Design a protein around this ligand. Structure first.
Ligand SMILES: O=C(O)COCc1ccccc1
Length: 185
């Protein structure tokens, strides 16, 4: 792909983080802690899952960023509406305001309803995410495999401002402690 010139500098919004997340000083890395991180509750925080939003809001244009997923067993990445549900149980789907892919149990899937099997020959260490607001497109790229396409959501109905979306996943196994990291431009 040739989307690199739409690179945007994403930072994480502490206020939206699940209370077990640890966000680095530079707001570019997140991992799930082994306990509650001693923050107050608020209506923005994802309560049920180890999720956090980027601070940036997008309502027009083309945007691109990259995320490092090295050594993780489970994660979700993409974009979501600013107005997504924060509290209780929900599925990641475009009907609920999410445009995402994930790794889970050694398979990759797109967050359609129902979910769609992805075909990845080279497990990615970094993921590129491209959003074209006007076109209604969200695309995912395998940076480890020379930028090969992973998945395109088209005919997207954003229906509001978009925010970068992250889930570091649980660490029941002891093998999923590693952070998600926003990679330099
Ligand atoms: O099972 C665990 O590792 C943590 O449980 C508490 C919790 C933390 C974050 C989100 C939901 C529940």
């Amino acid at each position: 792909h040739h989307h690199h010139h739409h690179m945007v500098h994403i930072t994480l919004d502490r206020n939206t983080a699940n209370s077990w997340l640890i966000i680095s000083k530079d707001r570019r890395q997140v991992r799930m802690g082994d306990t509650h991180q001693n923050v107050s509750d608020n209506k923005e925080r994802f309560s049920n899952y180890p999720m956090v939003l980027g601070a940036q809001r997008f309502s027009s244009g083309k945007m691109y960023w990259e995320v490092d997923v090295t050594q993780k067993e489970a994660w979700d990445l993409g974009v979501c509406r600013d107005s997504v549900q924060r509290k209780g149980q929900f599925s990641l789907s475009p009907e609920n305001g999410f445009w995402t892919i994930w790794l889970w149990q050694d398979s990759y899937e797109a967050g359609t309803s129902p979910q769609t099997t992805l075909h990845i020959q080279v497990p990615p260490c970094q993921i590129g995410i491209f959003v074209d607001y006007e076109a209604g497109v969200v695309s995912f790229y395998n940076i480890t495999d020379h930028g090969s396409l992973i998945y395109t959501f088209s005919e997207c109905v954003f229906a509001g401002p978009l925010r970068p979306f992250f889930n570091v996943g649980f660490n029941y196994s002891g093998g999923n402690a590693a952070p998600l990291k926003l990679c330099p431009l």
